[PDB]
Design a protein around this ligand. Structure first.
Ligand code: MG
Ligand code: MG
Ligand code: MG
Ligand code: MG
Lengths: 209, 211, 209, 208
């Protein structure tokens, strides 16, 4: 645009009409409630996994997103590239809180399913999730041999679902449960960034890291 | 820091957000779809009017050293019968008032200002915000009592379902009554300091409502 | 649809390329320099005078800005209505700083001149400016029998000029001196707000009040 | 403190920092002949935390002792940057300098290894022409290496970009223009530095 655009105090103080919440407010809202099942999306919700996706694109689809359909990419992505995935502090706080409550923690992902996967171990290790609270990662999808995200949220009777994408929130709404938004990091390679709060959902403050 | 010449900053601090429930007028309006006409209330000072000019002159005239002017009947006479000619209407309030007029709601103004024999505040409000006679109601001067919230009785008796205000006591009054209390941001240049912590009771706060 | 526009972390952290400064930094930049002459714009720079201008318009030109040409308005505005004007904290800090340095303070305004004025008095009293550093307000304009803003900056050899409007900054620029921007409050009746920093000038932080 | 709230003074509050854009930097160089400019690497042009994270988890999960482990650097400098995400802000600065015909140098505090593929990763990701590219320079306080300051002087760099305090003070020591880049909030190198602490120019939106 212009070289010296400047600014004004109206622009400096302008706020989008979003419902922000803190981990502490979420915990307070669960007080007295018995252990329950809760779910987390993985990519850009608990793990900054862009490193692997970046290398995958560079390796199999420099000029496109075809790598996401390449089975060769997924074998490596689900079996080791998450060693380069950075865990989010927001997720750490949320998981620690649910662990203290004794809730059952599930991880649901849209990643293509592979024969083996080391993601479940990476997650349990990174977030120090006790055995009684950990559950193997769930690969949701359309495939005839797998259930959809909505189906899994219902089957496991998850009462809360955390995610950064619009489909994460709509799935929660579709099931009639509480969908909570996590901010996607600005340096994520999955762009453009989604509009957190676009469904009137709660959005966790400072959850980009 | 105030003692730090070049404090600098970082992206974590730049993007940092307070956990507040922000709402827009449109969202409020939408949340009232299907609701029949109802009674709603508005605080006056720093909610619908930036009245600091008159309170500032009042302090300088009667209590330059203190806030005793607020207990001076001479001050209230001047404040309620003319000084609001210097009071600037808030745009956020214009939008709320128009929205409620469209719905056909009865609008009330409940203020902590002291009651005076005569008052021109009601007219200033009706003229500045173009409030039809059908929706307008004379201002209720509830006064301000120590250890007691004067607004509660009025919200109950007039059966107000929503109450807008910038001060904590406006929100706690709505909470005491079990109705929806919505916060309006007090301007940074208001002479009524310190600024309150909007969202301190988990209430909805209207975005960009400082002007 | 757009009832919930939401937001994202890129937008939350976005910054306009503005050269922000604080009063302490300004003070530090003047260390060792002998006392000098500095000038201040009045409206929305040192005084939030919108109350008087608002009443002026509603009284003399409820449909336009013609009131700005009405001598009856200026008689009221320059002789008492500033008793309703709110002094700015940023200005207070700047003036105290310059007084400490022993600088000579001047106030230049584009307000129409009147045979008498009590503005100078209101300024000296509100800001406790000692007689030694105080100077009667200077009224400038394109009009006759008057010197323009630029002419007054040159004649008094003002080395710094503080203002909220673009012409305050350009005037300083035209005289080769240091022009520093003050933010105009969002509730000022003089709209639209200007783009502070539009000339690459220094802008004082939190100077809207 | 469950509901701390906020106020408009807080919402509009600005830190006294000198912000600049790539366009303003380019404008300030108008009419200047080609010159040498240098860039720090980690968190300046590359979000290299993925590699440092794996290194930490592998060699010293409870500390930063891995930064002094030779085995770590061998892998970091020879392939782990394939997981390093280039920064858009750097992409713009580099294109800008390449258009000017300036000579670009990359100076890093990473431990030097026998071989390195970092220079290759940089040239490819940022499509730097052969005419403007220079092999990465490893600066160090070892009698075999030259310090960061010496390299800046040696190559007569006029501008140095970096996210760290020592990147800025190095430029200040050489009497050249040191410009700050914002370290991403999710970098594993914490705490984040205070950009602007030396009254230096800081590039807006440079966290990605
Ligand atoms: Mg995701
Ligand atoms: Mg009030
Ligand atoms: Mg002005
Ligand atoms: Mg660095």
């Amino acid at each position: 645009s212009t070289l010296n655009p400047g600014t004004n105090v109206a622009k400096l103080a302008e706020q989008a009409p979003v419902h922000w919440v803190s981990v502490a407010q979420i915990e307070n809202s669960l007080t007295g409630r018995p252990p329950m099942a809760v779910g987390f999306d993985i990519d850009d919700t608990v793990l900054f996994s862009s490193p692997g996706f970046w290398r995958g694109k560079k390796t199999y689809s420099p000029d496109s997103d075809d790598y996401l359909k390449n089975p060769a990419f997924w074998e490596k992505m689900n079996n080791g590239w998450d060693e380069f995935s950075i865990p989010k502090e927001a997720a750490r706080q949320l998981i620690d809180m649910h662990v203290r409550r004794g809730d059952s923690i599930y991880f649901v992902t849209g990643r293509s399913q592979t024969k083996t996967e080391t993601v479940s171990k990476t997650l349990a290790d990174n977030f120090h999730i006790p055995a009684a609270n950990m559950n193997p990662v769930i690969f949701a999808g359309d495939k005839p041999e797998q259930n959809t995200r909505v189906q899994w949220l219902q089957e496991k009777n998850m009462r809360i679902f955390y995610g950064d994408s619009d489909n994460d929130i709509t799935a929660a709404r579709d099931c009639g449960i509480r969908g909570i938004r996590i901010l996607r990091a600005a340096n994520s390679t999955y762009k453009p960034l989604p509009q957190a709060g676009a469904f009137g959902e709660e959005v966790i403050v400072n959850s980009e890291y």
